[PDB]
Design a protein around this motif. Structure first.
Motif, short mmCIF file in Angstrom:
data_model
loop_
_atom_site.label_atom_id
_atom_site.label_comp_id
_atom_site.label_asym_id
_atom_site.label_seq_id
_atom_site.Cartn_x
_atom_site.Cartn_y
_atom_site.Cartn_z
N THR B 103 0.81 -1.20 0.00
CA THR B 103 0.00 0.00 0.00
C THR B 103 0.85 1.26 0.00
O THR B 103 2.01 1.23 0.39
CB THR B 103 -0.92 0.04 1.23
OG1 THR B 103 -0.15 -0.16 2.42
CG2 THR B 103 -1.96 -1.06 1.15
N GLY B 104 0.25 2.36 -0.44
CA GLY B 104 0.83 3.69 -0.26
C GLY B 104 2.06 3.89 -1.12
O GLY B 104 2.26 3.15 -2.09
N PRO B 105 2.90 4.88 -0.77
CA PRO B 105 4.09 5.13 -1.60
C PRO B 105 5.05 3.94 -1.60
O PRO B 105 4.92 3.04 -0.76
CB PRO B 105 4.72 6.37 -0.96
CG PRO B 105 4.18 6.43 0.44
CD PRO B 105 2.80 5.82 0.37
N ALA B 106 5.99 3.92 -2.55
CA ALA B 106 6.97 2.85 -2.67
C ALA B 106 7.59 2.51 -1.32
O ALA B 106 7.97 3.41 -0.56
CB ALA B 106 8.06 3.24 -3.67
N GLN B 107 7.67 1.21 -1.03
CA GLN B 107 8.13 0.73 0.25
C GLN B 107 9.47 0.05 0.13
O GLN B 107 9.73 -0.68 -0.84
CB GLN B 107 7.12 -0.27 0.85
CG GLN B 107 5.86 0.35 1.41
CD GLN B 107 4.92 -0.70 1.99
OE1 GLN B 107 5.27 -1.45 2.91
NE2 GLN B 107 3.70 -0.74 1.47
N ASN B 108 10.33 0.29 1.11
CA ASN B 108 11.61 -0.39 1.18
C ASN B 108 11.50 -1.55 2.15
O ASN B 108 11.33 -1.35 3.34
CB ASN B 108 12.69 0.57 1.64
CG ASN B 108 14.04 0.23 1.10
OD1 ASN B 108 14.72 1.08 0.51
ND2 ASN B 108 14.44 -1.02 1.28
N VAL B 109 11.59 -2.77 1.63
CA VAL B 109 11.19 -3.94 2.41
C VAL B 109 12.41 -4.71 2.86
O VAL B 109 13.30 -5.00 2.06
CB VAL B 109 10.22 -4.84 1.58
CG1 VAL B 109 9.90 -6.16 2.30
CG2 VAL B 109 8.91 -4.07 1.24
N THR B 110 12.46 -5.04 4.15
CA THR B 110 13.54 -5.88 4.68
C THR B 110 13.36 -7.37 4.35
O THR B 110 12.26 -7.91 4.50
CB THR B 110 13.69 -5.71 6.20
OG1 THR B 110 13.74 -4.31 6.52
CG2 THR B 110 14.95 -6.40 6.72
N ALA B 111 14.45 -8.03 3.92
CA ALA B 111 14.44 -9.46 3.69
C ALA B 111 13.94 -10.16 4.93
O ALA B 111 14.61 -10.18 5.96
CB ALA B 111 15.81 -9.98 3.30
N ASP B 112 12.75 -10.72 4.81
CA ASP B 112 12.14 -11.48 5.88
C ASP B 112 10.99 -12.28 5.26
O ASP B 112 10.78 -12.24 4.06
CB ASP B 112 11.63 -10.51 6.94
CG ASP B 112 11.53 -11.13 8.31
OD1 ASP B 112 11.48 -10.35 9.28
OD2 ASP B 112 11.48 -12.37 8.44
N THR B 113 10.30 -13.07 6.08
CA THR B 113 9.06 -13.74 5.70
C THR B 113 7.92 -12.99 6.37
O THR B 113 7.90 -12.88 7.59
CB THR B 113 9.05 -15.25 6.13
OG1 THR B 113 10.11 -15.96 5.47
CG2 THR B 113 7.74 -15.92 5.76
N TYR B 114 6.98 -12.49 5.57
CA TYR B 114 5.82 -11.74 6.09
C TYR B 114 4.50 -12.54 6.03
O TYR B 114 4.01 -12.85 4.95
CB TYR B 114 5.65 -10.43 5.35
CG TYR B 114 6.88 -9.55 5.44
CD1 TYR B 114 7.98 -9.75 4.59
CD2 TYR B 114 6.94 -8.53 6.36
CE1 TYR B 114 9.10 -8.94 4.68
CE2 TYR B 114 8.03 -7.72 6.46
CZ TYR B 114 9.12 -7.92 5.62
OH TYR B 114 10.21 -7.09 5.75
N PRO B 115 3.92 -12.84 7.19
CA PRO B 115 2.67 -13.58 7.19
C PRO B 115 1.48 -12.67 6.85
O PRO B 115 1.36 -11.57 7.41
CB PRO B 115 2.58 -14.11 8.63
CG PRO B 115 3.21 -13.05 9.46
CD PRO B 115 4.34 -12.47 8.56
N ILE B 116 0.65 -13.10 5.91
CA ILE B 116 -0.57 -12.38 5.55
C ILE B 116 -1.71 -13.37 5.66
O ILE B 116 -1.65 -14.43 5.05
CB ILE B 116 -0.50 -11.80 4.11
CG1 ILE B 116 0.63 -10.77 4.02
CG2 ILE B 116 -1.86 -11.19 3.71
CD1 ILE B 116 0.84 -10.13 2.63
N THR B 117 -2.71 -13.05 6.49
CA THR B 117 -3.91 -13.87 6.61
C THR B 117 -5.17 -13.08 6.28
O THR B 117 -5.37 -11.96 6.77
CB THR B 117 -4.07 -14.49 8.00
OG1 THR B 117 -2.92 -15.29 8.28
CG2 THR B 117 -5.30 -15.39 8.05
N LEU B 118 -6.00 -13.65 5.42
CA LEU B 118 -7.27 -13.01 5.09
C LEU B 118 -8.38 -13.91 5.60
O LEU B 118 -8.25 -15.12 5.58
CB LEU B 118 -7.38 -12.86 3.57
CG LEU B 118 -6.34 -12.03 2.82
CD1 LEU B 118 -6.70 -11.98 1.35
CD2 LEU B 118 -6.40 -10.66 3.32
#
Lengths: 208, 125
Positions: B103-118
């Protein structure tokens, strides 16, 4: 590719449940996954928020890989009208285990399969499809009013005006009216209801 | 088709470091031959809107947050917002697929595993 797809599903034995006053009701639940899932079963009022005077047994359990199980539904209290149906929702929430583990995603789902739980008093005889021909249809402007003079929820499968389907259909509660959006038609109205056993009825035909 | 079946599918794009603005990261598919609409909310530690369609998610290893949610084009596909179980749900035609983006402006993302649950709900006609 780094992240795995989550596929998740739950199977219910029916799309509605009729709770006949004189007799508890049952609903089958099955787990298509090859791993166990958690199943939480609750009953909400027609507002889909307030808790209803019905409980499901078991209310919370773990369903094994591929297991099919029967849930039992019991009216616990409330003061049910004796002359018309009352609608509730029985919602079966299913939840998988947490998944086993540049930038990657760990994708997971929770799903809720909700069926109408329709309480039918002993004095309300027959089924909706017996009297679904009694729905009345009144055009005013670009809106179509349907009047239900019967003691049943009329769960419309289909309404077409001049062959053009109406979408965003909603059930018509007993002794009550609902307003639908005219589909840019008209004249001839055809409707089907979903029966107590989940099928579509024969069509009914009306002319405005 | 009989049964409620939901797929959440990762899409190519997400990378460690600077990401494309509004970059797609996942696709939601809801399949049922009887359903006409569904509601979906992200399941989250935080929420930006009352609709649970934008939220933050933290990496497993580092705890660093990324912002995720429905694309603005997925949101425009919504038919109505309903209050179900005490909370606002955006509803969608069961024939639409939805996109989850950064979302939102360009994001700088750290190497990790991100959990997303819907969390997905279908009320049967």
């Amino acid at each position: 590719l780094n992240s795995a797809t989550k596929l998740f599903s739950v199977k219910l034995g029916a799309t509605r449940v009729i709770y006949h006053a004189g007799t508890g009701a049952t609903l089958s639940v099955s787990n298509p996954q090859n791993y166990p899932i958690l199943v939480q079963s609750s009953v909400k009022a027609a507002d889909k928020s307030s808790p209803a005077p019905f409980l499901v047994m078991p209310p919370l359990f773990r369903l094994e890989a591929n297991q099919q199980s029967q849930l039992r539904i019991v009216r616990t209290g409330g003061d049910m009208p004796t002359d018309r149906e009352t609608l509730q929702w029985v919602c079966i929430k299913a939840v998988p285990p947490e998944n086993e583990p540049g930038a990657t995603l760990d994708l997971n789902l929770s799903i809720n399969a909700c069926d109408k739980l329709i309480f039918r008093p002993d004095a309300v005889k027959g089924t909706p499809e017996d009297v679904a021909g009694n729905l009345r249809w009144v055009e005013t402007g670009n809106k179509l009013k349907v009047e239900n003079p019967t003691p049943f929820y009329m769960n419309l499968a289909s309404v077409t005006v001049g062959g053009k389907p109406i979408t965003g259909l909603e059930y018509v509660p007993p002794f009550a009216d609902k307003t639908l959006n005219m589909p840019g038609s008209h004249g001839d109205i055809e409707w089907r209801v979903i029966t107590d056993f989940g099928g579509e009825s024969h069509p009914f035909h009306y002319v405005l | 088709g009989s049964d409620l079946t939901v797929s959440l599918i990762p899409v190519s794009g997400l990378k460690a470091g600077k990401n494309a603005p509004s970059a797609k990261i996942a696709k939601l598919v809801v399949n049922s031959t009887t359903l006409k609409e569904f509601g979906v909310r992200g399941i989250s530690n935080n929420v930006v809107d009352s609709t649970g369609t934008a939220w933050r998610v933290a990496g497993k290893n580092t705890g660093k947050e990324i912002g995720v949610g429905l694309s603005s084009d997925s949101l425009r596909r919504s038919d109505s917002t309903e209050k179900w179980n005490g909370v606002n749900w955006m509803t969608f035609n069961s024939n639409d697929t939805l996109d989850i983006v950064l979302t939102g402006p360009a994001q700088n993302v750290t190497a990790d595993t991100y959990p997303i649950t819907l969390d997905v709900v279908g009320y049967q006609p």
